[PDB]
Amino acid sequence: ASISTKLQNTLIQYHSIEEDEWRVAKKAKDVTVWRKPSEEFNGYLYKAQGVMDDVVNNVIDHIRPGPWRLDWDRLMTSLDVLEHFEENCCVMRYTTAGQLLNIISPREFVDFSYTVGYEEGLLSCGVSVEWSETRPEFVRGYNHPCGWFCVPLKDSPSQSLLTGYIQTDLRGMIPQSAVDTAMASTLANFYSDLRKGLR
**Expt. technique:** X-ray
Query: How many angstroms separate the CA atoms of 95 and 77, rounded?
Result: 6
- Backbone angles phi and psi of 108, in degrees to 5: -130, 140
The angle formed by the CA atoms of residues 144, 152 and 57, to the nearest 5 degrees, is 70
Say what the resolution is, in angstroms: 2.2
**Residue 62: closest CA among 191, 197, 186, 190:** 197
Per the structure, the count of domains in the chain is 1
Q: What CATH number has the domain bearing residue 76?
A: 3.30.530.20
The angle formed by the CA atoms of residues 30, 31 and 37, to the nearest 5 degrees, is 160
Question: Structural domain of residue 134, as residue ranges?
Answer: 1-199
Query: How many angstroms separate the CA atoms of 123 and 24, rounded?
Result: 23
Structural element, H or E, at residue 168: strand 168-169
Query: How many angstroms separate the CA atoms of 189 and 100, rounded?
Result: 14
The angle formed by the CA atoms of residues 7, 12 and 16, to the nearest 5 degrees, is 145
**Residue 102: closest CA among 174, 171, 166, 188:** 174
Hey, what long-range contacts does 83-88 have (CB within 8 A, 24 or more apart)?
88/114, 88/115, 88/116
Asked if 81 contacts 94 with a C-beta cutoff of 8 angstroms, the reply is: no
Q: How many helices (H) and strands (E) does the chain have?
A: 4, 12
The three-state DSSP-derived secondary structure of 79-141 is EEEEEECCCCEEEEEEEECCECCCCECCEEEEEEEEEEEECCEEEEEEEECCCCCCCCCCEEC
**Residue 186: closest CA among 170, 199, 175:** 170
Distance from the first to the final alpha carbon of the chain: 36
Asked if 46 contacts 183 with a C-beta cutoff of 8 angstroms, the reply is: yes
DSSP 26: E
Surface-to-core class of residue 113, CB atoms within 10 Å of its CB (0-12 exposed, 13-18 middle, 19+ buried): buried
3-state secondary structure of 166: strand
Distance of CA 13 to the CA centre of its chain: 16
- The crossing angle, in degrees rounded to 10, of helices 176-197 and 56-63 is 130
Strand partners for 127: 112
**Residue 181: closest CA among 72, 99, 109, 75:** 99
3-state secondary structure of 68: coil
The angle formed by the CA atoms of residues 134, 46 and 125, to the nearest 5 degrees, is 60
Query: How many angstroms separate the CA atoms of 148 and 14, rounded?
Result: 11
Strand partners for 114: 89, 125
Query: How many angstroms separate the CA atoms of 6 and 17, rounded?
Result: 17
